[PDB]
């Protein structure tokens, strides 16, 4: 039972919980020795694992339309937010090994901070899917939600933004030192003004352009 | 008796030959989940001919997997279908509901096929071009370092506790690095002249480095 | 046997619990002394007598400090 969950929370559907695009991981199995209210608890618990499966699908396909290396910075940051969710899967097992019995409520209880984290990153991933980013415009739609209102999802996206700046410092290291083009194929010649972040002021970006252009001459 | 009993004690060879093993444990639902699910089915009236599962323990199944994963082939569990490893359906420990099981072993078997095919590439070199030999030598230099960690884990199964959820996370930095070889090699196994056969292979690698530059 | 060694396992667990209860309420006694106090509490004993003894033997080394 307490390894059934540790795979049902992981990316494996099972015969107990039925994954669907209509409503994923619906418990349809009943035992006579269960109280009939355990299914509602199980719905609240299955919210967690449904979100994890959704994230895993979206990571699996990646890493004009949605192209470029930028989504392969977003997916890598999304690995980093999921990384203490895997450690927090190990800790449950470590508790389980010694204790003779445990109740579902404690697991439900302990993983409540990711009932804030997960839907509020689900909004971010769906907004990035429905629209198309091929510029440097991933930074806007993460930075729209980095202001946040709930404190775990405020630091979660900080992870992702630091990663995407790490990708940006390859473009802006070959550019600003070597004066090179094709540090990434987009979608004299200079950066397209439309895809530039507005929280970077435009004058500063022009200064960057001049510094890069001087190496050619 | 006298040899069979002493075998049964020391050697493990009984969950896959005569007298399939029975595992007594702590019972009651927390790791007795397979038996509860079976009883649930039996109450639910299939009705007859129970599902054939031979009852292997878990830590063992970890050993058989690590042997398959290291790169030595031909184990009894996980039959071939054309040379492709597939999950065997008599496996059950005392829980794991037999359906999540059949998915998770499939996932790891999919990673085992990736290394299987590379060892197949090499095994047909032992039963000239000189680029193929250098290729194989690179693969092997990677391979031995991969196999060493798995081989170390195998001792530690006897030792602590070792389970599926631990070995999956522990092998995370390897199962990352296998997925790229499955894509790089898939164009290096798909083709006549020795000069186009060399250029096309070098070109895959030369492209793949600039891909994540 | 083995089931007679599992009783001693359920005592070694139980004592770890008693040590945790001892530390979250903060006594100045450690595990070695506490085990003797557990021996005493097995026969059934009143602490209105025992606490005076502990606060006395800790008062019998202030002049030998």
């Amino acid at each position: 039972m307490i390894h059934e969950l540790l795979l049902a929370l992981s990316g494996y559907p099972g015969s107990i919980f039925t994954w669907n695009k209509r409503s994923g991981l619906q418990v349809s199995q009943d035992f006579p020795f269960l109280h009939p209210s355990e299914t509602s608890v199980l719905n609240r618990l299955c919210r967690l694992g449904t979100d994890y499966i959704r994230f895993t699908e979206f990571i699996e396909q990646y890493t004009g339309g949605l192209h470029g290396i930028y989504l392969r910075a977003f997916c890598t940051g999304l690995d980093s937010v999921l990384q203490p969710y895997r450690q927090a899967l190990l800790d449950l097992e470590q508790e389980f090994l010694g204790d003779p019995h445990l109740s579902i409520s404690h697991v439900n209880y302990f993983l409540d901070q990711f009932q804030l984290l997960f839907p509020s990153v689900m909004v971010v991933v769906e907004q990035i899917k429905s629209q198309k980013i091929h510029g440097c415009q991933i930074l806007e739609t993460v930075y729209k939600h980095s202001c946040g209102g709930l404190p775990p999802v405020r630091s979660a996206l900080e992870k992702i933004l630091a990663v995407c700046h790490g990708v940006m410092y390859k473009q802006l290291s070959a550019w600003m030192l070597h004066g090179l083009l094709l540090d990434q194929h987009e979608e004299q010649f200079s950066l397209r003004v439309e895809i530039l972040p507005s929280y970077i002021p435009v004058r500063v970006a022009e200064k960057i352009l001049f510094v890069g252009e001087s190496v050619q001459m | 008796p006298d040899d069979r009993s002493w075998l049964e004690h020391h050697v493990v060879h009984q969950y896959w030959t005569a007298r399939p093993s029975q595992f007594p444990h702590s019972l009651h639902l927390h790791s007795n989940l397979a038996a509860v699910w079976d009883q649930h089915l039996y109450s639910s009236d299939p009705l007859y001919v129970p599902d054939d599962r031979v009852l292997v323990t878990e830590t063992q199944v970890i050993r058989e997997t690590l042997w398959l994963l290291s790169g030595v082939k031909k184990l009894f569990i996980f039959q071939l279908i054309d040379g492709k490893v597939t999950v065997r359906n008599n496996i059950i420990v005392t829980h794991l509901t037999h359906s999540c099981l059949r998915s998770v072993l499939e996932q790891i078997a999919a990673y085992g096929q990736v290394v299987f095919r590379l060892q197949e590439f090499i095994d047909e070199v032992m039963g000239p071009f000189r680029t193929y030999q250098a290729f194989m030598w690179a693969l092997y230099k990677y391979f031995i370092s991969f196999k060493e960690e798995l081989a170390e884990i195998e001792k530690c199964i006897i030792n602590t506790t070792i389970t599926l959820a631990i070995v999956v996370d522990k092998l995370a930095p390897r199962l990352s690095q296998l997925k790229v070889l499955h894509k790089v090699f898939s164009t290096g196994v798909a083709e006549t002249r020795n000069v186009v056969r060399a250029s096309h292979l070098l070109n895959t690698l030369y492209k793949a480095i600039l891909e994540y530059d | 046997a083995a089931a007679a060694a599992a009783n001693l396992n359920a005592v070694r667990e139980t004592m770890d619990v008693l040590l945790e209860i001892s530390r979250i309420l903060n006594t100045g006694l450690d595990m070695e002394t506490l085990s003797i106090c557990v021996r005493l509490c097995e026969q059934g004993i009143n602490p209105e007598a025992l606490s005076s003894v502990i606060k006395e033997l800790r008062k019998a080394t202030e002049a030998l400090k």
Binding site: I2, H3, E93, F96, L97, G98, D99, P100 | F23, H25, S26, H30, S31, T57, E58, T59, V93, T94, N159, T160, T161, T163 | A2, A5, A6, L8, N9, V11, R12, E13, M15, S35, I36, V38, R39
Partner: peptide
């Protein structure tokens, strides 16, 4: 007697097939 015995070392061999401190 019991706390005299209690100064022993207990098993660190654990299994996932039992949860009541497997020996």
């Amino acid at each position: 007697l019991w706390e005299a015995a209690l100064t022993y070392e207990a098993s660190k061999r654990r299994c996932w097939e039992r949860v009541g401190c497997p020996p």
